[PDB]
Design a binder for these strands. Structure first.
Ligand code: NA
Ligand code: NA
Length: 327
DNA sequence: CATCTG
DNA sequence: CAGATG
């Protein structure tokens, strides 16, 4: 956690690069396990040879560790931090809708900058056009003071559309947290379930509303259960318009809400432990259910959840307010 | 994992 | 349809 941090980060930068630039998925994987395993390792790695002892770690890495340990740097790390090409890729990728692949094409196409991009909007898809348009906003964090004002509007509108809707805002928003990265809304209705053969309107109906009033301003994507888009806090008394923010809506068959809601809530850490305990309590949990565990190794059957309460009960645990769902 | 592209 | 992005 700090005894072998430099080494671990390195491997990360390294991993990163194999993946992002080179298409070295394998190598890229290679770095990751390594960092993962040095991660656990309890002592002060005092050498490569030492490290090699580790599973996951070979000669090439071990070699790298040496140079690192030996001198506060690594030539490869050095070169990769300079190379304006590889910098391009990390950069472009900062745009929504641009990943590595795209990033690489564009570069070899000669686009490595923001302006580069605008000059050739023509070359981007709807998402990326969008992404370029909001780069700034996209990067800005979401403050709860705003977060609240937004959830206010959402809930009120889903409500009008139909009193039977059930919306919930997950994320760290839900955990407590002062700011957040994007609005994530969970969505359901009684009239939609595991078996219930669909209902698309269920989703497009609300979406409609939001936009109706100008809260939803642009579309990243819109399926029949998921919608990725752009909302915006109606600017008040003209002088201070707000940042544009990523928001997502997702339909769920009622019978599987709470686990969803549980799960999207977090923390990643929380889930695990909670999940680990579920298992101890002879249970299994995932994004959708809670099944009694058979001793044969495994076994099925989704247990019924009417709330987040139902789940805890099951695993016979302390009901956790979202705040303390941290770790 | 769902949606988009082409 | 494969392949990419989130
Ligand atoms: Na991107
Ligand atoms: Na293939």
């Amino acid at each position: 956690e700090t005894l072998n941090g430099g080494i671990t980060d390195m491997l990360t930068e390294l991993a990163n690069f194999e993946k992002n630039v080179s298409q070295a998925i394998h190598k890229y994987n290679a770095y990751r396990k390594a960092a993962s395993v040095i991660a656990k390792y309890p002592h002060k790695i005092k050498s490569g040879a030492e490290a090699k002892k580790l599973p996951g770690v070979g000669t090439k890495i071990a070699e790298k560790i040496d140079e690192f340990l030996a001198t506060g740097k690594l030539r490869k790390l050095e070169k990769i931090r300079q190379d304006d090409t590889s910098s391009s890729i990390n950069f472009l990728t900062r745009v929504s809708g641009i990943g590595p692949s795209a990033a690489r094409k564009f570069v070899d196409e000669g686009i490595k900058t923001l302006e580069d991009l605008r000059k050739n909007e023509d070359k981007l898809n709807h998402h990326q056009r969008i992404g370029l348009k909001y780069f700034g906003d996209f990067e800005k964090r979401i403050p709860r003071e705003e977060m609240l004002q937004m959830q206010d509007i959402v809930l009120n509108e889903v409500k009008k559309v139909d009193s039977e809707y059930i919306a919930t805002v997950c994320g760290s928003f839900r955990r407590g947290a002062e700011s957040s990265g994007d609005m994530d809304v969970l969505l359901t209705h009684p009239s939609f379930t595991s078996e219930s053969t669909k209902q698309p309107k269920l989703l497009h109906q609300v979406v409609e509303q939001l936009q109706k009033v100008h809260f939803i301003t642009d579309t990243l994507s819109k399926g029949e259960t998921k919608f990725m888009g752009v909302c915006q806090l109606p600017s008040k008394n003209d002088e201070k318009e707000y940042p544009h923010r990523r928001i997502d809506i997702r339909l769920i068959p009622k019978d599987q809400y709470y686990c969803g809601v549980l799960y999207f809530t977090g923390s990643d850490i929380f889930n695990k432990n909670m999940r680990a305990h579920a298992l101890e309590k002879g249970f299994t949990i995932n994004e959708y259910t809670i099944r009694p565990l058979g001793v044969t190794g495994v076994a099925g059957e989704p247990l019924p959840v009417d709330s987040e309460k139902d789940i805890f009960d099951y695993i016979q645990w302390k009901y956790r307010e979202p705040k303390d769902r941290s770790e």
